[PDB]
Symmetry: D2
Subunit: 261 residues, 4 copies
């Protein structure tokens, strides 16, 4: 679909599952040279790699924890070592867990902030460092959430991490725009993934979330991979520092449908 | 580029020049059927129509003033009469003129609000009316501007029209998302078009504008038509109620570059 | 409470009822010289004036339709004629009516846009014109709504009017900030007023709206008058171009409480 | 000025200097009981404490590093132990340092995120924990910045910390609004404080900053403490989850003045 993506090197953190996996497969289909990432489970990457082989794509799997500076540095270097360059950096790794704010431990708060936000900073910093030092107009895509805008009770750490990612991305975008380096966020709504498999398999919980989505359905990973592929391409040549929400309308305030209030 | 766009009927207001023209050609290239629009004489639309023919596209030009209800209604009916249906409605017609707010006439204010906002309303209304009465999962793309967010002294009417268009679009998107009818805005930054041809002709004014664009260059119409094609496609299937900015970073506050403030 | 408001001339459009009335009474209590406004019913102003007399305040009632340029011009002049000056201009007049967007007539759309948005522009233009021509650091407060941000199905015209008012205010604020003229919006959530009396008297409808308000209760006009009084005072000396939401949390997405989604 | 503030217990982090100091004095003037905070030595807090004594206010100074959980907990307990309760918790402590993003160390990034965001979290958490376990309708005011919205090259960590603070606050406000616990942010623009004393000392840098402020002048701490007093008062009873900007117009995009672009 996107011809300019051919031969482009794409690194995606936490890409052995969910959205990250869907993005690695989509990029492989666009003839991009993908670098899949797994925290510790090298077995999880096997599946994505097989899917990538199935479409005649090229990719390697690199172990790396986004909260570990050396792992992030090594992840970017691995891409350059294997493919000779880096074009797109996608900070997709993330985690969440429901706890009432006044009962949330520092440990829980720090883990989410560290992975979701600090992890994205490290990945962004490394990709941009390479782009600057070698005069490459590469791009950085950060996997945010509708929650960088929609507050999230029980998930204050996640909301904060994403709200912070928003400003980080915008700052990075304004800072490196003169060098032609684009930095954007993708803001997914509810998307059928492993972290949601059990919750959404239950008709009661599935219907509840669906009632919060104006378009009436829970998105598929393909719908988000489509956003990333487009944002990375030259089609989005004049697009930077934005958050492209792919959420079925969640950010439109579903409680206000039918003229309520 | 987008296979799903083939055979789709796209109506674009004020598409004889600038962004509208570019989108009309881009949709022609996507093998879609296009209904171009001109305000006064059909001579104005022949350039676009010849461009569409050149790429093997199918199209017609229909006269219409977007502030005239019957004209807007006729425009939608003409598409349906000529191509049998309607899939994408793009409210692109617009106008602006600088005047200090406290000295701005009601006449000037009204001309801008009527065309930019009310005009967009009528077009969205007619297209959505058709989509609902026929349960068609159509889409409405409204051409906004960075000024639906960035205030604009001397263009208080333009800014308010786009700010109003933002809420109109969000409302329409929430109201019709249950029917799969997506409504999105595109927010262009400074784009080289006939309305800027003279201003950007003076290298001193072009340089002033470029200094407000983080990416350092005034955009080209193709960079916007790229956004319109994607938004209309099924690639943006889960995207509704958003404003996708393509401004090379304008909304990022250019005056705060290099840690200023 | 606010000492600098003593002797300040405050004009409030549509102040014979609801929030406007509460603001006129509050300003009178702050020893401000208030100019109440009624569209045609001079009898409605009687009540506000009596309430103003009850607190030992000073005020006059002026007839004026905000969609009529001459009425607006005359309203501002009346303040200067009676009290010798103008310090604060509050564009509070407004209207709404529920109609599905694809079924909304141009007449309905125009009436709401004309009163809510164009009416605010005229009032803002006149107040600012006076402020500029006489070197006065006066202020303009525009009565917006949570709907300048929250989409509103069935009320597309209202949402659009308020979204437009947001950009108008911001533009006016940036434009006249060099002259020390502040322009801000107040964004009320659900507030017990005449337009809501019948709807909220019904326990079922009252409970529905209350379920959309995080703080659990429908606000009182006094809670909004408190916002206006503060914004007009020198306490808000460094505040301009903002929208101060007084909504019990509506803009925080009530559908997302308890970690839903 | 605000009668309801008399006898209220206000805790303010990093209140020995700047904005924190000003708010502490302002709350003293409002006849409230204040708990001032200093990081290293109590010598630093004596200026504030003497200022509070001067106006007849009651107060104590409590040592505490906001990134140390036990210190934050002790700070809340000390207020409750000294004045019997807690009514207002103000997370003011903050820090920043310029470094190009791609060259920013994890250490620098962490120091800023930990103090600005995590520190604010701990304070909000402890205050809210107390408010919930005692069903007290307390309030939390978090000191953000225009940079929770305005991107800031060279301060990617600061910007992300405030962006994260915005979502944290919104989440906390939605989560606890049912209990009448209001949580709001204050977004100061450029304010003359010790962190800017040296930079604004050079008339060339002061002029550069002033040129980015629509209102033309760098704010004073009192202009911010004014906002804090109001937000804490019952005058803002229906205000929660907002960020009240006091920046003389910075968020209005100063580069777009006079119709530029
Ligand atoms: N699934 C959704 O509906 C949804 C909605 C909005 C945003 N998101 C965001 O999209 C991204 C993808 O989410 P997902 O649904 O696929 O979730 P996921 O949990 O399936 O994917 C996240 C991946 O990150 C990996 N990971 C976590 N911590 C890591 C670390 N320290 N180092 C390396 N890898 C690490 C995990 O092992 C996992 O495979 C996340 O950032 C998430 O917050 C998802
Ligand atoms: N050019 C830019 O840099 C830029 C930046 C942001 C937004 N926009 C927006 O994009 C759209 C396209 O702008 P453009 O640059 O091509 O401007 P344009 O003026 O060249 O295009 C608008 C077209 O609308 C037509 N038109 C105006 N009023 C009309 C009416 N009442 N009925 C019918 N046709 C009418 C005009 O004749 C014109 O051809 C507009 O909505 C504009 O506000 C443009
Ligand atoms: N009541 C709420 O809950 C709420 C919430 C958000 C925003 N608002 C806004 O606050 C303002 C006050 O609303 P309210 O609840 O008091 O409603 P209201 O209808 O009681 O007050 C509006 C007043 O405007 C007057 N008016 C209408 N059109 C006019 C015109 N053309 N010329 C002169 N006067 C005119 C009306 O006669 C009326 O007294 C409105 O702008 C409204 O949109 C109200
Ligand atoms: N000064 C401005 O122009 C301005 C503009 C926007 C926002 N702000 C914000 O307002 C707040 C006040 O800023 P300020 O200008 O007075 O800055 P400041 O640095 O003078 O005040 C912050 C105080 O926090 C203390 N502090 C820092 N880290 C701490 C820690 N870990 N534990 C305890 N105390 C700690 C510092 O010693 C200092 O006295 C900050 O949150 C700042 O980011 C200030």
């Amino acid at each position: 679909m996107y011809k300019d993506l051919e031969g482009k090197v794409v690194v995606i953190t936490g890409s052995s599952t969910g959205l990250g996996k869907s993005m690695a497969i989509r990029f492989a289909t666009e003839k991009a040279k993908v670098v899949v990432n797994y925290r510790s489970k090298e077995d999880e990457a096997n599946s994505v790699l097989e899917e990538i082989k199935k479409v005649g794509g090229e990719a390697i799997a690199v172990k790396g924890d986004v909260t570990v500076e050396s792992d992030v540095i090594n992840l970017v270097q691995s891409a350059i070592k294997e493919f000779g360059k880096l074009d797109v950096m996608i900070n997709n790794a993330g985690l969440e867990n429901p706890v009432s704010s006044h009962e949330m431990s520092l440990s829980d708060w720090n883990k989410v902030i560290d992975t979701n936000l600090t992890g994205a900073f490290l990945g962004s910093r490394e990709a941009i460092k390479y782009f600057v030092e070698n005069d490459i107009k590469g791009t950085v895509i950060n996997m945010s959430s509708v929650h960088e805008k929609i507050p999230w009770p029980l998930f204050v750490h996640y909301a904060a991490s994403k709200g912070g990612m928003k400003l980080m991305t915008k700052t990075l975008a304004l800072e490196y725009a003169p060098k032609g380096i684009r930095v954007n966020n993708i803001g997914p709504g509810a998307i059928n993934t492993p972290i949601n498999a059990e919750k959404f398999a239950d008709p009661e919980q599935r219907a509840d979330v669906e009632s919060m989505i104006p378009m009436g359905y829970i998105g598929e990973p393909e719908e988000i991979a489509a956003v990333a592929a487009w944002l990375a391409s030259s089609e989005a040549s004049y697009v930077t520092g934005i958050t492209l929400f792919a959420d079925g309308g969640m950010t439109l305030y579903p409680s206000f449908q039918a003229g309520r209030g």
